[PDB]
Amino acid sequence: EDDLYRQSLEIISRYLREQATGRRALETLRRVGDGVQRNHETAFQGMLRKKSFSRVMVHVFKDGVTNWGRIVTLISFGAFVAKHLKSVNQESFIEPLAETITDVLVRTKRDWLVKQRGWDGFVEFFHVQ
C-alpha cells in the first residue's frame, strides 16, 4: 500500500544486488552512483571501516537540507558497502542493508520525496549527462 516505499525498495534492492553479485530510475542510479563511488573511493573505504548506518544516514540530513545529491550518495555508499559484503562472502546482509536504506529514506524524507515527485524527480534532476 505504500507504493512509494515499494518502488524505492525495488530500485535500491536491485541496485545493491546488481552492484554486489523504474527501469529509467535504475539506469540513472547506476550511472550517477558509479561516478560517486569512483570519485570517492578512498572516503568510502574510510567510512566502511567504522544498523547505525541508519543514524549516520539521518545525521547527513540534520542541518535540515535534503537534495538528490545527498540521496544518491547515500545509496551509492550502500552499493559500495554491498560490493564489500559480496567480497567477504556476507551477501546475506545485502537485503537487510537495502531494506534499511529504504526505510530511513522513506521514513524520514517521505514529504520531501512526494514534493519532488518521487523517482520521477530523481530521473529529471540527473537527466543532463
Binding site: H40, H59, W68, G69, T73
Partner: peptide
C-alpha cells in the same frame, strides 16, 4: 555523516551546474 553530507552536496552542486 559529515563525509557523506559534503560529498552529497558536491554531487548536487555539480549537477545543478550541468543543468
Amino acid at each position: 555523516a559529515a563525509x557523506l553530507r559534503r560529498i552529497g552536496d558536491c554531487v548536487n552542486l555539480r549537477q545543478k551546474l550541468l543543468n
